[PDB]
Design a protein around this ligand. Structure first.
Ligand code: 0IM
Ligand code: 0IM
Ligand code: 0IM
Ligand code: 0IM
Ligand code: 0IM
Ligand code: 0IM
Lengths: 155, 155, 157, 157, 157, 157
């Protein structure tokens, strides 16, 4: 009964996030995607959850839930003690290392990092929204469903 | 039936390695420590395997084996496709990211990185051997068994 | 035939920027300095002030011109028939961030980015830090062209 | 008479900060901890509360004293007859941004900066992260001086 | 007439290198690929084999030519009437060591260096890692030009 | 009373090292430059040559002395009644590596390490790169003290 939580704001989820989800789902019996409401973004929590569920239909051991407060409480209240997160740069690692060691200290929750797929090294939710806002084509970087939903928000 | 391989030269295994072993063993049903013979070190492969087995007696789902050649062949010939490795710095991440993406490309094997425990951020097999060689006390950095075995090699 | 765009907010231009301009102008037939304005946040200097400070300190570069713009940099570049951006970089940290944007710009528009290492003497000057130091009275005259220094002190007073 | 200034916001002081203070006080004849007041961003503790928390945790350091400061740090340093800053560093990116500021401070005023590596146990503690964790009920008692923790629980109630 | 030199050992050339060559040839009137011979470390392919592999993979680049070089790179560059180097970068630590060399080359000879970010697909390929993987039977065909791969299988038999 | 050790192989000393020496000598009552010799690998300069090159370029620093040693740096430090090492750092990459050794040195012997940011003008000089450039005939006279340059060219010829 292994399991991990994949956290983030996912505003919106990108193909980089989805690649991490599929990789976590392939190595752990249970995966929970934690959509963290940070109470100002583009999509509502429900819409963000919707887009992830649509894009993770092929992953039977994955579910999607919203959460508030400490991530470690979200993890431990579901019987787990591992977090899985994607990393692009050494700079990412240093910032995330601080939070990973804090989370282990306060609650015994482990963090496992996975290297980004090379093709998505440059995609982030914020850069994809910025480029799309000014008319650039980001369709190769986002799940097909998400892309249409993003156009709607702009138009 | 989840599982991961923890690779390295482990010449000798340190408390930093052992911390990664225990963390991998807590999140995967099966863990194999792969002692990679790089065919010049201090300990023989058999001695390195011995010291790890002695220090991992409390971990029932972990075993220790030697290997040669491509790590991904070692992993896949045992039915697994995940590697777990410890990281200390962003610099570590960048070097290891290259190998992780290569390994995923050539064989579909995933790599999960874990942040070092803060207390062991500065310990490496090479620095521990260097300091011990010149008379410094490294007993707080190595498993009790390993420490005695290292003194023997020097004296 | 060859050409490159050197973008930034240049609020204000520094000696580190001018070094990049000179090195680009030496290696490309034409260089356009692109003063990118955020229509939603005013900086310290207006667009015309930024352009005049750059023009005054690049008068000896005959193949360089200065133009403002907004929106996607790649559109500014391609509308001028060009395909290359030249940017200065100070650290490995600079490189990871700028690498994200350079790969995105290549992905969406085919525009290449060439990075150049800062001159050592300017490794530590940035528009933001020079403004912050000047605000509290520190002497930054050796980090900014003559075209900028006293205009900066005037803005602060 | 050697000496150095240890600057920061210390809102609140952490055991990481205290480790730096102790190491500085062991190597310089005099150390001044400079509690940097920011007229804009007012955090969780008042300046006087921050000073009293540092004084409580540094009671065994007779050559260290604590004062509030405002404006340009190199003026604070040089107005006290000193010309060195001591700061703790956790990571390589810590070094990058701090390196720019140190080179700037050396250029504008001749003040030098000495960096010390964090004790391993505190590499992950910061004032901001400790406050955030504590706000949602996490136990950060092992990361802060004994007295800070009680004062921090009171501010949250 | 603008131009740049693309240096390396290219033992063997990878698709990452070729991407850099193509981007340099698109932006400079002339590009010279400099295959750096090292009298000490002789790798897997002879200099002439390396040159022929690069020429095969760059057949569609008419303004790029390939030559061997020895000794100080800035002499090679300046003996050909050029004063720019173009190199690909993968990571922030790539930038660090390369930044030192670029500043040194600018200081000692006035030669500038322009860095281009790797195409994302090749961020993990290097000559050394491709050789090592291939030596133990791994399939690196998608990371090398078609012709290199055949030649590489022959050297391993 | 206060004191610090500045260690290195200094083969040979550079202007970047001398800058660190001067900054340490300004902040500590005494400074010892520790020339650490590897008895198993000769460098370019003998131990006596390294010491004389340092002494000749530090003659204006009355509180600095130069001594060689081998083995554990912390033993050199503590045998002189001191507890502090001062080292220059150029990058975040420098910092991660040196942080490992500094934390180990603190762990095994209680010795503190203070790092100082390189002067910008010397960010790119290292003993190894200056030797490599000089070997192939590049001009490094502005990166080394007078005490070194011609002795270096003599070694190479
Ligand atoms: O923040 C984002 O916006 C965002 C969007 N895609 N990816 C992501 C990209 C590559 C690999 C894994 C994730 C991110 C993240 F990693 F930075 F987290
Ligand atoms: O190489 C070594 O020698 C060595 C020895 N301990 N640890 C290690 C240290 C901290 C956390 C995890 C591992 C290493 C390693 F990570 F660098 F791999
Ligand atoms: O951001 C700024 O305001 C700024 C101002 N000077 N320089 C700069 C410094 C050195 C070399 C090239 C440019 C920057 C930059 F590095 F960030 F690009
Ligand atoms: O900013 C903070 O809030 C903070 C709080 N503890 N430490 C710190 C941690 C370890 C060693 C030295 C200091 C910091 C700092 F280094 F980031 F400065
Ligand atoms: O050294 C090598 O062997 C090698 C082989 N491919 N690439 C490379 C990879 C991606 C983009 C550009 C070049 C390198 C280099 F960048 F590390 F230079
Ligand atoms: O390794 C060397 O040989 C060397 C030679 N000069 N400098 C140096 C450069 C700038 C500031 C301080 C020192 C080094 C060092 F950075 F690596 F320490």
């Amino acid at each position: 009964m292994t399991g991990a939580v994949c956290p983030g704001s996912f505003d919106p989820v990108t193909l980089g996030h989805l690649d991490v989800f599929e990789r976590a789902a392939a190595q752990f019996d249970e995966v929970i995607v934690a959509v963290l409401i940070n109470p100002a973004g583009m999509f509502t929590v429900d819409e963000r959850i919707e887009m992830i569920r649509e894009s993770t239909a092929d992953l039977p051991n994955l579910r999607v839930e919203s959460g508030q407060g400490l991530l470690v409480d979200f993890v431990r209240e579901r019987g787990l003690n591992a977090i899985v997160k994607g990393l692009r740069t050494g700079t990412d690692f240093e910032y995330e290392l601080q939070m990973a060691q804090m989370n282990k200290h306060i609650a015994g929750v482990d963090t496992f990092f996975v290297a980004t797929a090379p093709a998505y090294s440059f995609v982030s939710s914020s850069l994809a929204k910025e480029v799309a806002t000014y008319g650039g084509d980001v369709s190769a970087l986002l799940p097909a469903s998400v892309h249409q939903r993003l156009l709607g928000k702009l138009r």
